[PDB]
Amino acid sequence: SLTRIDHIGIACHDLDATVEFYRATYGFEVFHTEVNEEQGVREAMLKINDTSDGGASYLALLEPTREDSAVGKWLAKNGEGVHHIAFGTADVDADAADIRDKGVRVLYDEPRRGSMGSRITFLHPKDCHGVLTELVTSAA
Amino acid sequence: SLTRIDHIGIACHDLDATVEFYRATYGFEVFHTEVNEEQGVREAMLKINDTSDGGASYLALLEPTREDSAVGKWLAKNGEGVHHIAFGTADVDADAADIRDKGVRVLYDEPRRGSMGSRITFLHPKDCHGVLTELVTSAA
Ligand SMILES: CC(C(=O)SCCNC(=O)CCNC(=O)[C@H](O)C(C)(C)COP(=O)(O)OP(=O)(O)OC[C@H]1O[C@@H](n2cnc3c(N)ncnc32)[C@H](O)[C@@H]1OP(=O)(O)O)=[N+]([O-])[O-]
Numbered sequence: 001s002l003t004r005i006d007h008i009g010i011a012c013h014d015l016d017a018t019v020e021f022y023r024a025t026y027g028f029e030v031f032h033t034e035v036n037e038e039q040g041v042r043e044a045m046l047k048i049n050d051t052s053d054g055g056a057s058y059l060a061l062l063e064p065t066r067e068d069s070a071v072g073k074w075l076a077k078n079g080e081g082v083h084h085i086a087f088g089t090a091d092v093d094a095d096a097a098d099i100r101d102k103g104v105r106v107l108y109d110e111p112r113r114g115s116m117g118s119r120i121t122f123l124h125p126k127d128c129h130g131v132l133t134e135l136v137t138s139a140a
Numbered sequence: 141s142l143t144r145i146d147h148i149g150i151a152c153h154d155l156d157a158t159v160e161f162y163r164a165t166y167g168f169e170v171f172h173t174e175v176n177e178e179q180g181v182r183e184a185m186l187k188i189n190d191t192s193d194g195g196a197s198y199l200a201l202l203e204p205t206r207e208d209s210a211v212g213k214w215l216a217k218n219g220e221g222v223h224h225i226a227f228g229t230a231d232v233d234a235d236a237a238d239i240r241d242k243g244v245r246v247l248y249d250e251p252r253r254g255s256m257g258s259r260i261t262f263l264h265p266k267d268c269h270g271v272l273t274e275l276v277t278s279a280a
């Protein structure tokens with residue numbers, strides 16, 4: 001089952017400038033920074049709080065590594081802003097299989113690598129009332 | 141200081157249908173339901189997790205009460221999807237005054253009523269890299 005908000009994915013043109021905006025305005029600091037060449041993003045995770053399921057909630061700031069990527073395509077069309085929401089689970093494989101069985105489009109056959117060794121999948125936004133929705137299991 | 145993700149504001153055309161989608165797909169149940177005639181919304185809050193600052197993280201599903209509202213204007217232009225993100229604080233008045241002093245546009249002179257007796261204000265999206273950003277203090 002989905003037991004937390006894991007993160008909010010926020011697309012930006014300039015990761016360093018957007019990271020500085022969050023630090024200067026809210027005092028949020030960088031927890032981790034990772035490039036995912038498969039997904040085509042450079043990511044900075046800012047930890048906001050721990051959660052009651054033992055995990056944490058982050059802002060995931062995302063700059064595209066290339067125009068030909070989910071995030072580069074999205075920024076060109078929409079401008080900077082919220083790109084996706086992510087829910088955490090102890091078993092992304094099980095929860096993804098259960099959602100697939102309800103007729104919601106799951107974008108991967110098997111969960112893929114996300115940041116900090118996590119395993120992730122996505123649900124099609126047109127099946128989720130316009131919200132690109134990620135499911136996350138932490139490596140721990 | 142901002143100590144949690146308080147909620148994700150998600151705009152929808154039909155609150156009851158979108159509430160049912162979240163229940164049926166993820167098992168999330170309705171924590172509260174409130175109409176805010178000032179803001180022009182009918183809201184359902186779905187609690188996802190408790191947080192390390194003593195608060196909680198919700199999905200706030202929002203259907204417009206009228207076309208002439210922040211959310212009715214937004215849905216007409218953008219379709220269903222994420223409308224805003226909200227951060228929690230023990231002192232929205234203090235934190236809003238500090239952000240005003242950095243030159244980020246605060247939309248209210250004084251925090252206004254949000255759901256469940258909360259006090260809220262908003263930061264202009266064009267000052268926050270495209271994210272409409274709410275600050276929330278719970279009534280408790
Ligand atoms: C590393 C990691 C991350 O989270 S990095 C995140 C970057 N990765 C991804 O986005 C991968 C999954 N995303 C996707 O495949 C794309 O978002 C979607 C499902 C494929 C869309 O694929 P498409 O090839 O169709 O692109 P397209 O723009 O045509 O999208 C088709 C339709 O989906 C809508 N759409 C696309 N992106 C969307 C988004 N981010 N939110 C809402 N709607 C979206 C879009 O508006 C269009 O509908 P519309 O005609 O009514 O406007 N991590 O650690 O968690």
Ligand SMILES: CC(C(=O)SCCNC(=O)CCNC(=O)[C@H](O)C(C)(C)COP(=O)(O)OP(=O)(O)OC[C@H]1O[C@@H](n2cnc3c(N)ncnc32)[C@H](O)[C@@H]1OP(=O)(O)O)=[N+]([O-])[O-]
Binds near residue numbers: 211264
């Ligand atoms: C009850 C409660 C709730 O949260 S209910 C939430 C509903 N309330 C609100 O949204 C009130 C605060 N919102 C606002 O005042 C509006 O979102 C904004 C700041 C005023 C925009 O006001 P405007 O009169 O200018 O409308 P307008 O569409 O012209 O907005 C002007 C610019 O802001 C952008 N914008 C508007 N809404 C946006 C949003 N939700 N996210 C991102 N950008 C947005 C929009 O794209 C446009 O830029 P663009 O030209 O590049 O596209 N609670 O308990 O927490």
Ligand SMILES: [Co+2]
Binds near residue numbers: 086
């Ligand atoms: Co993500």
Ligand SMILES: [Co+2]
Binds near residue numbers: 147200224226274
């Ligand atoms: Co709100």
